[PDB]
Design a protein around this ligand. Structure first.
Ligand SMILES: C=CC(=O)N1CCCN(c2cc(NCCC(=O)O)nc(-c3ccccn3)n2)CC1
Ligand SMILES: [Mn+2]
Length: 298
């Protein structure tokens, strides 16, 4: 009986507030930093077109076994062929059309399978595809793809993830002499509990497809989550550094909540932004075939 965590804040900025992402995130910060994650719905007219080279988009997804940690004790696809596989998997698993499966049912079934010792569900995830390989999901004035006059406002938009500031201030940067990543998801494909490198911000955009479910923990409960992890994670991974342990830190949010860790959830739909604040532990899974883009900013 999985209990859905409370909903994270959702913001619907007007066209005035939507003029600058960094200004908007700083003003919603007093609330969103207390929940770890937040969702931002752009104005209804803001619809960036999909600019990925779909004709050339090929990738080999990684294999995910949902119950790999509880059990302790691949084809190359195009975007079309992966989606046909993703839709056939979900429609066969739930025995109904893909768009008719309630998001609460996929959520309850995902967490049952993760801890299931009898059912071994295996899915695939097109994870960590660089935007340099086939182009960003957003229009970019890089001269390698045709940008129409109606699309130029999106190539120059501050909410275009390619236009987010990524350079961190340091003395090393002045003594010296990032790009968004793409995620093609299917039903039950997931990412486990982790924080971004250098406790960085991260913004995620779902270009199209089925929703992506998120779980977020505010930064003021980061040490409590890490303590709960060490107490409940397998002992063979107890001594591993964070950069490696984060690869195998899948945990039911109700287990964290039972130990007093505040967890917030949300369903990121197509065309919606999710922002993760510094040192906000987050995890989640995809409701079905979708396409997401994410970048770290500061
Ligand atoms: C956390 C490890 C993890 O579960 N995986 C599998 C899932 C895909 N992938 C991801 C995904 C992700 N965010 C989800 C975005 C989305 O899927 O839309 N963040 C990272 C990451 C890794 C190191 C440092 C910072 N971030 N890696 C690779 C490792
Ligand atoms: Mn990440």
């Amino acid at each position: 009986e999985f209990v859905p965590p409370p909903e994270c804040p959702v913001f619907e900025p007007s066209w005035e507030e939507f003029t600058d992402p960094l200004s908007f995130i700083g003003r919603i910060r007093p609330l969103a930093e207390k929940t770890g994650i937040c969702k931002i719905r752009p104005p209804k007219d803001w619809q960036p077109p999909f600019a990925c080279e779909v004709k050339s988009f090929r990738f080999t997804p990684r294999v995910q076994r949902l119950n790999e940690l509880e059990a302790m004790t691949v084809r190359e696809y195009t975007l079309q062929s992966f989606g046909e596989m993703a839709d056939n998997f979900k429609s066969d698993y739930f025995n109904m059309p893909v768009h008719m499966v309630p998001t609460e049912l996929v959520e309850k079934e995902f967490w049952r399978l993760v801890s299931s010792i009898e059912e071994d569900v295996i899915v695939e995830y097109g994870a960590d595809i660089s935007s340099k390989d086939f182009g960003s999901g957003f229009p970019v004035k890089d001269g390698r793809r045709k940008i129409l006059p109606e699309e130029e406002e999106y190539a120059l938009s501050g909410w275009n993830l390619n236009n987010m500031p990524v350079l961190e201030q340091s003395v090393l940067a002045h003594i010296n002499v990032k790009v968004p990543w793409l995620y093609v998801g299917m039903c039950f494909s997931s990412f486990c509990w982790h924080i971004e490198d250098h406790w960085s911000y991260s913004i995620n955009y779902l270009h199209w497809g089925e929703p992506k479910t998120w779980y977020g923990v505010p930064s003021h409960a980061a040490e409590q989550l890490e303590e709960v992890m060490r107490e409940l994670a397998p002992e063979l991974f107890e001594s591993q550094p964070d950069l490696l342990h984060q690869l195998v830190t899948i945990m039911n949010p109700n287990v964290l909540m039972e130990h007093g860790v505040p967890v917030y959830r949300t369903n990121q739909c197509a065309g919606e932004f999710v922002v993760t604040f510094p040192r906000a532990y987050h995890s989640g899974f995809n409701q079905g075939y979708n396409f997401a883009e994410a970048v770290n900013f500061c």
